[PDB]
């Protein structure tokens, strides 16, 4: 679990969005596993606007942060789950690191701010949904 709170927006994994997120929908994209809802309170977070390929993510299944080197946002095949059929997920960044299904929503940050959120995992891999291209989150 986890979310990004920036301005009057809440960014969550689309597959973990609540009834309230859908009732206050701003934008969603199944191919990216992202959903953004509107909030009444002003949010706590800054979005990175950079090309960093290193950063630190929070891993809930270890209660720890880990440093990672990650690939640039790209189209990656993701196996079928209870949430989606087998498909290519876009704007996904992979890194070697620990992840379990409940780790989705953990934030990845660099020195410039929030880069993205955990969205996939595998045997010693962790995948992050990028948010740096969503310029409208800042206005
Ligand atoms: C072994 O580590 C795992 C195993 C399985 C997963 C879960 C996973 O990847 N998905 C299930 C939820 C929707 C995801 C999507 N973006 O399509 C895909 C994991 O997530 C962090 C770590
Ligand atoms: Zn950066």
Curated annotation (Swiss-Prot):
Source domain of life: Viruses
Reaction(s) catalysed by this chain's protein: Selective cleavage of Tyr-|-Gly bond in the picornavirus polyprotein
Binding-site list for Zn(2+) 1: 50, 52, 110, 112
Q: Where is the active site?
A: 15, 33, 104
Q: What does this protein do?
A: Cysteine protease that cleaves viral polyprotein and specific host proteins. It is responsible for the autocatalytic cleavage between the P1 and P2 regions, which is the first cleavage occurring in the polyprotein. Also cleaves the host translation initiation factor EIF4G1, in order to shut down the capped cellular mRNA translation. Inhibits the host nucleus-cytoplasm protein and RNA trafficking by cleaving host members of the nuclear pores. Counteracts stress granule formation probably by antagonizing its assembly or promoting its dissassembly.
Q: How does it assemble?
A: Homodimer.
Protein name listed in UniProt? Protease 2A
- This chain's source organism reads Coxsackievirus A16 (strain G-10)
């Amino acid at each position: 679990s986890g979310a990004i709170y920036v301005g009057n927006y809440r960014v969550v994994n689309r597959h973990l969005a609540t009834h309230n997120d859908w009732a206050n929908l701003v934008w969603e994209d199944s191919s990216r596993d992202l959903l953004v809802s509107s909030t009444t309170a002003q949010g706590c977070d800054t979005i990175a606007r950079c090309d960093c390929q290193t950063g630190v993510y929070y891993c809930s299944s270890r209660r720890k942060h880990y440093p990672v080197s990650f690939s640039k946002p790209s189209l990656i095949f993701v196996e079928a789950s209870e949430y989606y059929p087998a498909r290519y997920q876009s704007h996904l960044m992979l890194a070697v690191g620990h992840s379990e299904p409940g780790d989705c929503g953990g934030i990845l940050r660099c020195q410039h701010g929030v880069v993205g959120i955990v969205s996939t995992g595998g045997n010693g891999l962790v995948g992050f949904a990028d948010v740096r291209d969503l310029l409208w989150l800042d206005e």
